Amino acid sequence: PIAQIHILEGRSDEQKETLIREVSEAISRSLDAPLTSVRVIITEMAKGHFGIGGELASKVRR
Amino acid sequence: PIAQIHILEGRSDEQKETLIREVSEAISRSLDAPLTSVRVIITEMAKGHFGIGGELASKVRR
Amino acid sequence: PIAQIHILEGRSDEQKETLIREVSEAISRSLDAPLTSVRVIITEMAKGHFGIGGELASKVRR
Amino acid sequence: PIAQIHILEGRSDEQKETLIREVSEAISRSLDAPLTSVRVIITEMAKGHFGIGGELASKVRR
Amino acid sequence: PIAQIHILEGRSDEQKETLIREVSEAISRSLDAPLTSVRVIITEMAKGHFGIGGELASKVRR
Amino acid sequence: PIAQIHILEGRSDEQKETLIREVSEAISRSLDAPLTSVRVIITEMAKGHFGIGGELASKVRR
């Protein structure tokens, strides 16, 4: 399984590391797949490249 | 956060349901984000549409 | 420019056709790009393959 | 609905903002979905990371 | 490396098989990476889900 | 056809150029499509944004 996760910029490397570890275990337990076959890609979005309801995330999020 | 997960076809709806629930919480706890902002997309691949090392998964996986 | 749009299953072919036409023009006008260079991909998700807040869309949307 | 748009680097923040706003309204009108549920991700590509017909966009585009 | 390839529906399984094999080797030779670490995902688009220049591919391609 | 390739950061521009050229020809020969219609997007991943088996690629790859 491959997971690509888009998140707004801002998190710490520690949080991203945890994210990768947690999501990998979640996928592994859920599908009963070896943890070693799980790949996770984190794609960070700049506040000016994400829109919700038509507005920029920078005008509406931290 | 938005997560797209590519998995091989075959799992039950129960397993996918669990996948969606488990990955959502993992993301939520990890980034300390409200569980309600987390979206998860499961994309299923046909065994003849996934290749590892140049070989089809149908030739090399269950 | 290339746009991939993930939407829940259910729309008519007419609506999707309109989606493709309307998003293409929006991109074209917005970036001042020739309408002919714009590609649009519509990816439909099964209600059991999309989750919002940990819950399936089939349990939480029409 | 979620839209991911890949575009070559170069546009202004104003153009990207418009893109996000225009595409969101286009998706909303087309599908008759609340504008507030539409998310748009803009992924910018470096001229050296996009190829058309085998050539780099930097050799063949502004 | 992971490659996702979007192609119009219609090809035979033989052609897709070749696609997967040929792109895997191309990536392997190009990046000087072990062929065994290369994953390829083929995503097929329905003619009514792909638009070029605002028009559906079913209206404009075989 | 459109190809998006995720690779770890580190390659040279020459290698990426080759990758784009090789993959484009591979897709073109395989599908018997005009080379001019093939688009290739290279998305580079930071060693800290890719996980394999739950670990960061930075702890386990060059």
Ligand SMILES: */C(C)=C/C(=O)C(=O)O
């Ligand atoms: C998930 C994409 C698993 C995989 O690729 C493998 O089985 O090696």
Ligand SMILES: */C(C)=C/C(=O)C(=O)O
């Ligand atoms: C993750 C994509 C979160 C989000 O969209 C939000 O904060 O509403």
Ligand SMILES: */C(C)=C/C(=O)C(=O)O
């Ligand atoms: C958007 C992806 C435009 C493009 O590919 C072109 O300029 O041909």
Ligand SMILES: */C(C)=C/C(=O)C(=O)O
């Ligand atoms: C489009 C992806 C809409 C959506 O997620 C929602 O209904 O909240």
Ligand SMILES: */C(C)=C/C(=O)C(=O)O
């Ligand atoms: C490409 C995504 C290669 C990879 O995952 C690996 O080195 O195992």
Ligand SMILES: */C(C)=C/C(=O)C(=O)O
């Ligand atoms: C592959 C996506 C080919 C294409 O878009 C075209 O036929 O112009």
